[PDB]
Amino acid sequence: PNPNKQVVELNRTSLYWGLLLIFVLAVLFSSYIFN
Amino acid sequence: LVDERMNGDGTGRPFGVNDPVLGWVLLGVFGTMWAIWFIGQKDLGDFEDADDGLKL
Amino acid sequence: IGTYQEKRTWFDDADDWLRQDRFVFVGWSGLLLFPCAYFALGGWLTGTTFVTSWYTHGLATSYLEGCNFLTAAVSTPANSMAHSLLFVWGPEAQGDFTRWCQLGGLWAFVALHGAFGLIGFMLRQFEIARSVNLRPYNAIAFSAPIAVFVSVFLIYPLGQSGWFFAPSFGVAAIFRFILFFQGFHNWTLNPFHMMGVAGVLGAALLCAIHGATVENTLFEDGDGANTFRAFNPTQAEETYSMVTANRFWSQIFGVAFSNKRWLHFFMLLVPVTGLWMSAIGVVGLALNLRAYDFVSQEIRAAEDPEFETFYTKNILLNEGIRAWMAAQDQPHERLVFPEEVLPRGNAL
Amino acid sequence: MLTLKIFVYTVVTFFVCLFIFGFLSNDPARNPGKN
Amino acid sequence: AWAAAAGAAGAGYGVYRYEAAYGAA
Amino acid sequence: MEALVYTFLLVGTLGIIFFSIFFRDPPRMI
Amino acid sequence: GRDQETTGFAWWSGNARLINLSGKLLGAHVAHAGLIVFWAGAMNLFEVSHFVPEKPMYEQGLILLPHIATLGYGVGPGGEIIDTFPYFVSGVLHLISSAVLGFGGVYHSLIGPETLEESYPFFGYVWKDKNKMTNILGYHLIMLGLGAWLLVWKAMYFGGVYDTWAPGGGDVRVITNPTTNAAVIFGYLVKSPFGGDGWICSVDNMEDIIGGHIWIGTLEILGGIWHIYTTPWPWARRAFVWSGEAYLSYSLGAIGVMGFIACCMSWFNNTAYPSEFYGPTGPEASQSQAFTFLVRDQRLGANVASAQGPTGLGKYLMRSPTGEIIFGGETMRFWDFRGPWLEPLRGPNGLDLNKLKNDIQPWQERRAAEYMTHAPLGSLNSVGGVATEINAVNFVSPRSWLACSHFCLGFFFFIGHLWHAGRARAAAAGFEKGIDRFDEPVLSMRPLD
Amino acid sequence: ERPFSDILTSIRYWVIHSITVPALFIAGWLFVSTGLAYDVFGTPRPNEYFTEDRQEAPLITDRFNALEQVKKLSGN
Amino acid sequence: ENSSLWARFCEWITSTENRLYIGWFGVIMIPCLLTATSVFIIAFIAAPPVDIDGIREPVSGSLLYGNNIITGAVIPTSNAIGLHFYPIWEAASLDEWLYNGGPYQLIVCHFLLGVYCYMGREWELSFRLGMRPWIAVAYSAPVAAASAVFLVYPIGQGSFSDGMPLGISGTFNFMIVFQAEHNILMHPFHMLGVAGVFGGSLFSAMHGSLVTSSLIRETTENESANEGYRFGQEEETYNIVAAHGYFGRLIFQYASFNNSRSLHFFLAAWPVIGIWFTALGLSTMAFNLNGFNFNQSVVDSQGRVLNTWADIINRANLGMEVMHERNAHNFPLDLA
Ligand SMILES: CCCCCCCCCCCCCCCCCC(=O)OC[C@H](CO[C@@H]1O[C@H](CO[C@H]2O[C@H](CO)[C@H](O)[C@H](O)[C@H]2O)[C@H](O)[C@H](O)[C@H]1O)OC(=O)CCCCCCCCCCCCCCCCC
Ligand code: CLA
Ligand code: CLA
Ligand code: CLA
Ligand code: CLA
Ligand SMILES: CCCCCCCCCCCCCCCC(=O)OC[C@H](CO[C@@H]1O[C@H](CS(=O)(=O)O)[C@@H](O)[C@H](O)[C@H]1O)OC(=O)CCCCCCCCCCCCCCC
Ligand SMILES: CC1=C(/C=C/C(C)=C/C=C/C(C)=C/C=C/C=C(C)/C=C/C=C(C)/C=C/C2=C(C)CCCC2(C)C)C(C)(C)CCC1
Ligand SMILES: CC1=C(/C=C/C(C)=C/C=C/C(C)=C/C=C/C=C(C)/C=C/C=C(C)/C=C/C2=C(C)CCCC2(C)C)C(C)(C)CCC1
Ligand SMILES: CC1=C(\C=C/C(C)=C/C=C/C(C)=C/C=C/C=C(C)/C=C/C=C(C)/C=C/C2=C(C)CCCC2(C)C)C(C)(C)CCC1
Ligand code: OEX
Ligand SMILES: [Cl-]
Ligand SMILES: [Cl-]
Ligand SMILES: [Fe+2]
């Protein structure tokens, strides 16, 4: 019965920013990771 | 010679045509679509009097 | 005061005079900003005008020498001073002002008072936002110019062999530090600068678009052709159609902002994330942890004499920058290159 | 190659004549603002 | 309507039509 | 092999662009 | 004068106050046309005063004197300047005419009537009157048409113009046979703009230039008479905006292309812009270098045909991608360069190396060596080499100033097109002041657009 | 009080700033034209860059003994 | 019905109810920028190597020829072609087109003709939505800078091989070679362009933070503050007086913009004018005007050269130009 219970929300525009961010970083950095 | 070219790289041809069918492409496609615009000109307004544009 | 009513000490008599709504706000931070920022600007304008760089660098950098605005600078100390702070009471200068200027100690005068000036300016805008009772986002954005300044002017030379390889405070002097990082660090290729470009050059896009989207979706709130007159900052309604602005870009670019608060935070976010990433790359270059080489394309281009990319062209251009400037860029090395040992293409 | 050139000149002049006769087909009246 | 200097006569109200509620411009 | 990984990261980025336009969360007015 | 609240225009857009003020707008243009003639008088006499005869015309930073030299006033064979007094008369006749244009420009701006509609009905105009606008358009085409016949009369009858392609070297040549063939004249216009064509920047002789101005002179006299006696047809009512800012934006997009054309005209062409007066072109100086070291090394005992470069293509002579024997090096890109010093060495099958091993003339290597040290690269403070060059000479080519100024002016006037054509189309539609806030047209559209 | 436009238009501003402002410009003119700027800041005059000992650029090359070395590099 | 075939096509092209607006500029833009997009992706992945320099050494730029995302590029056209027009049908084989840099000139011709029409339909939808027009004037500044690198600088230098390569590391080569030949850093129009993107990044963070720091309390601390704005609400979600009255105490009171409409004009005009200059600066150096050359400017008595920082830039400049295009030059002056 913790009164400090919260929920996380993530709308689809934040999904589209998040998925883009980890693919663009994978487009960027993996050229260096595969070297 | 060795291969086959079109040989028009620096020849300065009018609209870049060298087979006469290319000029009829230019007139056919312009003429087909001038005619579609001309027949469809009855839906664009009859701007017949003198003060009949988008003016200010 | 404090809802318990103590008697005011001399602090409260000093706090209300500093936090006074006069013409220029001093505040408590102004005891740190205004002495330091006046001496960074005063040190830069004196050093570019009068102070030589003939001993630290072997090259003239003042207006009194013959330089103009582009080529004059307050140049870094020699590589023989290592990371010496070059206090005028220091072991190198030893009280003499006219030799402290010749030893390049006026560089570290500007760099240290500029560094504590940036602390004084960032504390200024915490202090004003607590007076005005706003949110502190103007200061948090200024963490990124402090992230750039500390990582380039302070953190980078501390990892190198001295304050020599710091940027000198000038126009053409920044430009060689820029050309130093291409030739030596291959700093365009570093993916932290790539995130730094996309932040800086993407905030310039957001500045130009949000400025033009607002200015072209304005409501007709006036009669005349000057649309700047049809505004009062105490109005409760938006001055431009956000709904028209959304439908415009959702059909031009396909994706538009629908939230005005997310837009202006995204304008906040892009230049700050861009500069913090680029500051990490200069931290990496302080240790010479470069993103210099793709080793899989160096092994191939050395085992195949016809494999040329624009990458291997860039590696050859950096060899040109390194050998042709370092007889004059690094005079402490005292390296003489005979003209037949420097790299050279055909007929140039 | 000439078959490709005839095709591109049919294609490009199709879209250029859409452009030209589109603005001749009463573009300035396609405003929402009435006078 | 007072017919401003590029044609395009003004649609009724003057400059900053919220002066009645806000008082300035 | 890595070129297969490169194109998958480029196709995957162009996939998110396609979904962010044609399957965006639509802005509800009022 | 006039203020803001009586117009709705601030001080920074106050020439827009005199849109519907016909007389004030007339004095605005006549005083501005005074400035164009005043600059052309003042900068001419500035260039006459600073002309030094023991230096080339292109070395001295002269951009207006090569235009009067191209007409053939005061030039000799080979581009030698005979006298400078014909350049002085052109400077004074503009500097005196600028006071006359300056007077009536100041007159109609201050004393003359604000709108000349009710008192002077011939000069009066409303912007929406499509007859009167074509009437004024027809008057000025006849002025442009008769102005184009001044170049034809000066080339055919009044002493001739400078032909840099003349037999015996370049001098002033009366153009007795201008080319009036429509297949040749209208063949430049439909030519591609790319390499080997250069749209109308490759016009290679003065007979096409003068014969082309016969065509542009007659068509503008005929097209002026056409617009005086006609009104725009109903399809033209349907396509255009009929405001004064629209007519400006139509002129701004037309003149911004013309700035781009004269940018590439002065950079590439060396017939209407002779190299004796304007200096070598970009292609001319790069081809002059390969010609200079080809003559330098034939005399030092080397077969320049059989000489293989470090890449294997040929150090001095290589083959064009269409099969012409051209100069080797990075100047393979400028192989379609033609020059009056180079074309005597060129046969059908490209350059003729039999003609080029035996019949290099001493005047050709004089001139090509001049063009190599006057390449159109410089600096902004007029240094005169590559960016890696010390302060030795004082040179930026006029072609480098004429192209760079007129790309920038051509770029901004395309921006001025996009400004005013967007505004005049929107101001005629009614929403140039903003969204109406009562009927916002997005609010009457279906969402999920 | 005094909002930056009743100062610049006041004549008492210009009965001060037409005397102190030119005498401060001349004070800057004479700080350099009397050669004192070359002495205070230690910038070398155009006849002081190269002594007879060296004909090259100076090099400080010593940390704790730089104070008397730059006296020897300058030629004093 | 009464409406013809062409009239129902015009009401569909100019329809504001399409998801992506087309317009009459979009009947040019869409088949242009789908042509250049399709041939970019195929040539970035699978194009065979390209003789960029015209000296019959090919340069690889494709993922299938041993490149990654950074070093891959669509290589510019051959130097032997120059400014000549080289479509597919002017080649003998398709592989000769691929060898001579043919894909580059097809991308660049369709990309430039597509961004001129992207700018055209940003005007057009503004006119269809009842907007004021000049978002297109703001987009003319990246259009001019794209036009400078792919069209105008090749026109001035006389070859599309001097155009910008279509890739990441190919761009970097284009910048480094540019600074050796033209000294772009010492050019004032590039200096103004840097002031436009450093100012435009300052002002994006400045205007972006003052609005964020003036948000009216609408939500709790358990939900983002971006929830406090509703799309389509007519009230104004932040305090402009508190934002203006904060930047007023930060430096000066009359150094701020109390007018939010005047604020957003300056917010648009600082990057756009700055990029307008660096697009022209690149286009003036296209004609070899070049950057300031202060080399051997400071000279002491007895006529001897004192170096400056510009002389050190020259040592970095002439290191690149003795190494760029290292086999092209048979002659000592890089006039091309
Ligand atoms: C190497 C070569 C390369 C090619 C050549 C390249 C260069 C070509 C440049 C040529 C010049 C082009 C200029 C064209 C201007 C068109 C302007 C226009 O919008 O023009 C608009 C006007 C409109 O005219 C008016 O249009 C009106 C429309 O009426 C309609 O609507 C009315 C109400 O509005 C009434 O209801 C009426 O009953 C109804 O009919 C009226 O009919 C008027 O009578 C009529 O005068 O058109 C007109 O004046 C006539 C327009 C000019 C003639 C067009 C000919 C097109 C080509 C024909 C050949 C085709 C060949 C096909 C080959 C097939 C095999 C392959
Ligand atoms: C080529 C430049 C040019 C020209 C020809 C004009 C012309 C004009 N402007 Mg514009 N203007 C310009 C640039 C120009 N302007 C610029 C750059 C700005 C922005 C600062 C403006 C801002 C502006 C505003 C805000 C307004 C005008 C107005 C006017 C008109 C009335 C002038 C008047 O009453 O002044 C009276 C001023 C004077 C008499 C001062 C003396 C100036 C004289 C003319 C100088 C002549 C010197 C010359 C050497 C004389 C030679 C004489 C000859 C015999 C040799 C006039 C037609 C007004 C308008 O629209 O009218 C309805 C108006 O309200 N202008
Ligand atoms: C547009 C056509 C044009 C062209 C091609 C030239 C070309 C030339 N001129 Mg001429 N000139 C022109 C217009 C032109 N000028 C005009 C309009 C004037 C009247 C002012 C003159 C007056 C003039 C004189 C008096 C002299 C020349 C000289 C020269 C030569 C060298 C110029 C130089 O070093 O510039 C250096 C480069 C610049 C000054 C850059 C100009 C950039 C401008 C200032 C825009 C800057 C942007 C800025 C942000 C906008 C400002 C406004 C903003 C603050 C609000 C060169 C042949 C000289 C010469 O050779 O004489 C024989 C010479 O003595 N010109
Ligand atoms: C300053 C010059 C000028 C101006 C502004 C006008 C303005 C006008 N003219 Mg006039 N005209 C002029 C000179 C001028 N004219 C001259 C010199 C002639 C004699 C040749 C004519 C003969 C003339 C006739 C016979 C007619 C006009 C008409 C018109 C009107 C509409 C024109 C239009 O929409 O074209 C739009 C142009 C097109 C749709 C053609 C397509 C253009 C594309 C780009 C292809 C062009 C190919 C061509 C061969 C050029 C190739 C090179 C090019 C790429 C640079 C407008 C009022 C019409 C009108 O209403 O008048 C009563 C009309 O019927 N004009
Ligand atoms: C012959 C061309 C022409 C003509 C007649 C007009 C006429 C007009 N314009 Mg347009 N305009 C033009 C070209 C033209 N413009 C171009 C090329 C541009 C793009 C730059 C614009 C951009 C423009 C804007 C943005 C606006 C106008 C406006 C106006 C109106 C009032 C302008 C005024 O009072 O200026 C006042 C003059 C000034 C305030 C001084 C400006 C000086 C600038 C800083 C340049 C300084 C010169 C400098 C040496 C050039 C450096 C660049 C160089 C490197 C090339 C009037 C209808 C205004 C209007 O009411 O719209 C209808 C308006 O808001 N114009
Ligand atoms: C092939 C392209 C290139 C490959 C790219 C690979 C990487 C892709 C990364 C992005 C993945 C998707 C991110 C999240 C999308 C989202 O949440 O949409 C939300 C919308 C919800 O809208 C609502 O959906 C409702 C249906 S329902 O509620 O979902 O049942 C519907 O009724 C309503 O109209 C609608 O508004 O989803 C849909 O409309 C349909 C369901 C989408 C299912 C996910 C697809 C996963 C990708 C598979 C593609 C093939 C991969 C293998 C081959 C390469
Ligand atoms: C309206 C106005 C304006 C404008 C104005 C103008 C633009 C004017 C113009 C004017 C002009 C345009 C003028 C001119 C003049 C000229 C003159 C006055 C001349 C004279 C001449 C002479 C004097 C000569 C001499 C000589 C000789 C004979 C030879 C030798 C040399 C000499 C030089 C000596 C302004 C903007 C201000 C503003 C608003 C108002
Ligand atoms: C002198 C000379 C010459 C000649 C020339 C000529 C003869 C010219 C002419 C020219 C021409 C003859 C030109 C024309 C032009 C035209 C144009 C450029 C057009 C434009 C168009 C437009 C602009 C349109 C638009 C639109 C559309 C699209 C549709 C309709 C409507 C609108 C408006 C929308 C030569 C070269 C031989 C040589 C040198 C010198
Ligand atoms: C360092 C030092 C010191 C001393 C002193 C000082 C701190 C001083 C300051 C000083 C200063 C604080 C100075 C200032 C200066 C300024 C200037 C030098 C400015 C100039 C300006 C100009 C040159 C401008 C021009 C122009 C322009 C560009 C814009 C507007 C217009 C005109 C044209 C006018 C001390 C003891 C602390 C300690 C040791 C170190
Ligand atoms: O193309 Mn790309 O970079 Ca105008 O310089 Mn010569 O060419 Mn080439 O080398 Mn250096
Ligand atoms: Cl070469
Ligand atoms: Cl290279
Ligand atoms: Fe905003």
Using DSSP, state whether G220 is helix, strand or coil: helix
**Experimental technique:** cryo-EM
For chain G, which residues lie within 8 Å of any Cβ of chain D, measuring from their own Cβ? Answer: 235, 238-241, 425, 428-431, 436, 441
Name the CA dihedral angle for D18, D22, D24, D30, rounded to a multiple of 10 degrees.
Answer: 180
What pairing do the DSSP bridges indicate for beta strands G171-173 and G317-319? unpaired
Distance between CA atoms of residues G407 and G416, nearest Å: 14
Exposure pattern of H38-76 as b/e (b: 16+ CB <10 Å)? Answer: beebbbbebeebbeeeeeebbbbeebeebbebbeebbee
Using DSSP, state whether I81 is helix, strand or coil: coil
Distance between CA atoms of residues H67 and H63, nearest Å: 9
Taking the CA of residue C212 and the nearest CA in chain E, the distance in Å comes to: 21
Q: C222: exposed, middle or buried (C-beta count within 10 Å: 0-12, 13-18, 19+)?
A: buried
Q: Which residues contact G289 (CB under 8 A, 6 or more apart)?
A: G329, G331, G372, G375, I331, I333, I335
The closest of I292, I295, I294 to I190, measured between CA atoms, is: I292
Distance between CA atoms of residues G403 and I144, nearest Å: 16
Strand partners, G81: G75
Q: Answer for the pair I122, I25: CB distance below 8 angstroms, yes or no.
A: no
Distance between CA atoms of residues I284 and I290, nearest Å: 7
Exposure pattern of C125-156 as b/e (b: 16+ CB <10 Å)? Answer: bbbbbeebebbebbbbbbebbbbbbbbbbbbb
Resolution of the coordinates, Å = 2.7
Number of domains within chain G: 2
Q: At what angle do helices B20-39 and I5-13 cross, to 10 degrees?
A: 90
Distance between CA atoms of residues G209 and G180, nearest Å: 10
Q: Answer for the pair C165, C104: CB distance below 8 angstroms, yes or no.
A: no
Residue I207 main-chain phi, psi, to 5 deg: -65, -30
DSSP type of residue G435: B
Distance between CA atoms of residues I245 and C121, nearest Å: 17
Residue that is written with structure tokens 């961004």 in the block: I115
Interface residue C300 vs chain G (CB under 8 A):
no
Residues G76 and G220 in one domain: yes
Give the torsion sign (CA, I112, I117, I120, I126).
negative
DSSP type of residue C306: T
Give residue B16 CA to ligand 10 midpoint distance, Å.
Answer: 29
What Rg, from alpha-carbon coordinates, does chain E have?
11
Q: I216: exposed, middle or buried (C-beta count within 10 Å: 0-12, 13-18, 19+)?
A: middle
Neighbours of G389 (CB within 10 A): 22
Give the torsion sign (CA, H42, H43, H46, H48).
positive
Touching subunits of I (3+ CB pairs, under 8 Å) are A, B, C, D, F, G, H
Q: I126: exposed, middle or buried (C-beta count within 10 Å: 0-12, 13-18, 19+)?
A: buried
Q: Which residues contact C286 (CB under 8 A, 6 or more apart)?
A: C151, C155, C156, C157, C158, C159, C160
Q: Which residues contact C223 (CB under 8 A, 6 or more apart)?
A: E2, E4, E10, E11, E12, E13, E14, E15, E17, G8, G433
DSSP type of residue C348: -
**Are residues I2 and B40, on separate chains, in Cβ contact within 8 Å?**
no
CATH architecture observed for domain H1-76: Up-down Bundle (1.20)
- Two structure tokens written together for G227: 């617009």
Give residue C185 CA to ligand 9 midpoint distance, Å.
Answer: 34
Neighbours of H17 (CB within 10 A): 13
Q: How far is CA I94 from the centre of its chain?
A: 30
The closest of G426, G440, I134 to C215, measured between CA atoms, is: I134
Q: How far is CA G266 from the centre of its chain?
A: 7
Distance between CA atoms of residues G270 and G288, nearest Å: 14
H helices of chain C, in order, are 10-18, 33-47, 97-100, 105-131, 137-141, 143-149, 156-159, 172-180, 191-215, 242-252, 260-286, 295-303, 310-329
Domain of G89, in residue numbers: 1-279+376-449
Q: Answer for the pair G427, G245: CB distance below 8 angstroms, yes or no.
A: yes
Q: Is chain F adjacent to chain A, meaning 3+ CB pairs within 8 angstroms?
A: yes
Residues G80 and G181 in one domain: yes
Taking the CA of residue G20 and the nearest CA in chain I, the distance in Å comes to: 22
Give chain B's largest Cα–Cα span.
65
Q: In C, which residues are within 8 Å of H42 by CB distance?
A: 51-52, 98-99, 101-102
* Residue G309 zone, left/alpha/beta (φ > 0; ψ -120 to 50; rest): beta
Q: In B, which residues are within 8 Å of I3 by CB distance?
A: 43
Q: Which of G70, G204, G215, G233 to mutate to test the pocket of ligand 8 (most atoms within 8 A of CB)?
A: G215
Name the CA dihedral angle for A20, A23, A29, A35, rounded to a multiple of 10 degrees.
Answer: -160
Residue that is written with structure tokens 């001093």 in the block: C26
What number of residues does chain G have?
449
Distance between CA atoms of residues C300 and A35, nearest Å: 12
Q: I231: exposed, middle or buried (C-beta count within 10 Å: 0-12, 13-18, 19+)?
A: middle
Distance between CA atoms of residues G107 and G24, nearest Å: 9
Q: Answer for the pair I181, G386: CB distance below 8 angstroms, yes or no.
A: yes
H helices of chain I, in order, are 5-13, 23-46, 94-99, 102-128, 135-147, 153-157, 168-182, 188-212, 240-250, 260-285, 309-321
- Two structure tokens written together for C330: 């690094």
Q: B45: exposed, middle or buried (C-beta count within 10 Å: 0-12, 13-18, 19+)?
A: middle
Residue B48 main-chain phi, psi, to 5 deg: -95, -40
Domain of B19, in residue numbers: 1-56
Residues G219 and G324 in one domain: no
Chosen domain end from G375, G397, G420: G375
CA angle C287-I307-H54, nearest 5°? 100
H helices of chain H, in order, are 11-14, 20-33, 36-40, 66-74
Distance between CA atoms of residues I57 and I45, nearest Å: 20
Give the torsion sign (CA, G316, G319, G321, G323).
positive
Distance between CA atoms of residues G173 and I332, nearest Å: 38
Chosen domain end from G328, G344, G375: G375
Q: Which DSSP string do the residues of G274-304 spell out, in sequence order?
A: THHHH---HHHHHHHHHHHHHHHHHTTS--T
Starting from the CA of residue G35, give the closest ligand: 7
Residues G159 and G305 in one domain: no
Residue I199 CB-half CA count within 13 A: 17
Q: State the distance between the two ends of chain D, measured CA to CA, in whole angstroms.
A: 53
List own/partner pairs for G308-311 with CB under 8 A and 24 or more apart: G309/I330, G310/C346, G310/I327, G310/I330, G311/I55, G311/I56, G311/I57, G311/I327, G311/I328
Distance between CA atoms of residues G266 and G160, nearest Å: 21
